[PDB]
Curated annotation (Swiss-Prot):
Transmembrane segments: none annotated. This is Pumilio homolog 1. The gene is PUM1. GO terms for molecular function: miRNA binding; mRNA 3'-UTR binding; RNA binding. Residues 144-148 are annotated as: Non-specific-nucleotide binding in RNA target. The chain holds residues 828 to 1166 of 1186 of the full protein. The keyword Cytoplasm applies. Residues 36-40, 108-112, 180-184 are annotated as: Adenine-nucleotide binding in RNA target. GO terms for biological process: 3'-UTR-mediated mRNA destabilization; adult locomotory behavior; miRNA processing; mRNA destabilization; positive regulation of miRNA-mediated gene silencing; positive regulation of RIG-I signaling pathway; post-transcriptional gene silencing; post-transcriptional regulation of gene expression. It comes from Homo sapiens (Human).
Length: 339
């Protein structure tokens, strides 16, 4: 079982335990749920000499700590508060095992912390081991976190091989629960020459993406943070389909974001389209106000519709105000309307 020192520490025998006092017991403490937290907190404010004593004791088996549920935290604290020499030695211990660590539940967090704190040179040395394994890491439950961090932290020129690996795979990655997150990071951090081919593939498949459970969020991202040129292409895809996409579980989110982020003229064209559109025995507005998803698009269209059109819109809603109150969704509208 545990050493007596660790057992006593866990039983609160030592209210002032110090790092120097756990000499010889550091690997064990690092892999203990409470011993690890103790070391994590102490390293935050230990003197550099105190950090080195801890380090000298774990260096030889650092890799073992890297893949341990509690030991990985101690390794991370070194990248966070340690000396350049310690980070360098850890990077050297990581060399040749970046892929293995990136795919490991705890090791992936060590790689992420290292990327955030090591020099461009060692970042490049680490990211390059992923060459030929990009798509696998992007889709992996642990590996996607490493790829996302590379995108946020590494010089863009060193990320070119990752962009290259996405050629023709943007639709598949955007409809993946882990891959969609990597695509969003690319859009936020990469250079225009790198985001261009990605956006090109997103635009090509917008029709399918807006209806996908994960894909719609990538499109929403472009609507929320993208360039006007890109937002306009997406709006163009929604134009003429406001009625049908509004009633879609996922596409309705994109339609909503279009109303919110399209140009002045664009929002107009879209709102207009909903008033003059028909849906069988009634108007488009009619069907939408009471739909569980489409109702939000109607609400938001109000909050954004320029006074001129706002009148018209409602002028077409009142007549049905009776049947309106017959629904849970039409009440948010029932409210706003009353004014």
């Amino acid at each position: 079982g545990r050493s007596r020192l660790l057992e006593d520490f866990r039983n609160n025998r030592y209210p002032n335990l110090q790092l120097r006092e756990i000499a010889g017991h550091i690997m064990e403490f690092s892999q203990d749920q409470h011993g690890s937290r103790f070391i994590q907190l102490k390293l935050e404010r230990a003197t550099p000499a105190e950090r080195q004593l801890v380090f000298n004791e774990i260096l030889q088996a650092a890799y073992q700590l890297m893949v341990d549920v509690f030991g990985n935290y101690v390794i991370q604290k070194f990248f966070e508060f340690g000396s350049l020499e310690q980070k360098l030695a850890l990077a050297e211990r990581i060399r040749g095992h970046v892929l293995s660590l990136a795919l490991q539940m705890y090791g992936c967090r060590v790689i992420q912390k290292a990327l955030e704190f090591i020099p461009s040179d060692q970042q490049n040395e680490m990211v390059r081991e992923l060459d030929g394994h990009v798509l696998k890491c992007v889709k992996d439950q642990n590996g996607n976190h490493v790829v996302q961090k590379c995108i946020e932290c590494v010089q863009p020129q060193s990320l070119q091989f990752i962009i290259d690996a996405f050629k023709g795979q943007v639709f598949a990655l955007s409809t993946h629960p882990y891959g969609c997150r990597v695509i969003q990071r690319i859009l936020e951090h990469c250079l225009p020459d790198q985001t261009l081919p990605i956006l090109e593939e997103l635009h090509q498949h917008t029709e399918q993406l807006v209806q996908d459970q994960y894909g719609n969020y990538v499109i929403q991202h472009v609507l929320e943070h993208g360039r006007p040129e890109d937002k306009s292409k997406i709006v163009a895809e929604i134009r003429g389909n406001v009625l049908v996409l509004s009633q879609h579980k996922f596409a309705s989110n994109v339609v909503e974001k279009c109303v919110t982020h399209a140009s002045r003229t664009e929002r107009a064209v879209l709102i207009d389209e909903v008033c003059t559109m028909n849906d069988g025995p009634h108007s488009a507005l009619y069907t939408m106000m009471k739909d569980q998803y489409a109702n939000y698009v109607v609400q938001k269209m109000i909050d954004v519709a320029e006074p001129g059109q706002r009148k018209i819109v409602m002028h077409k809603i009142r007549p049905h105000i009776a049947t309106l109150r017959k629904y849970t969704y039409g009440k948010h509208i029932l409210a706003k309307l009353e004014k």
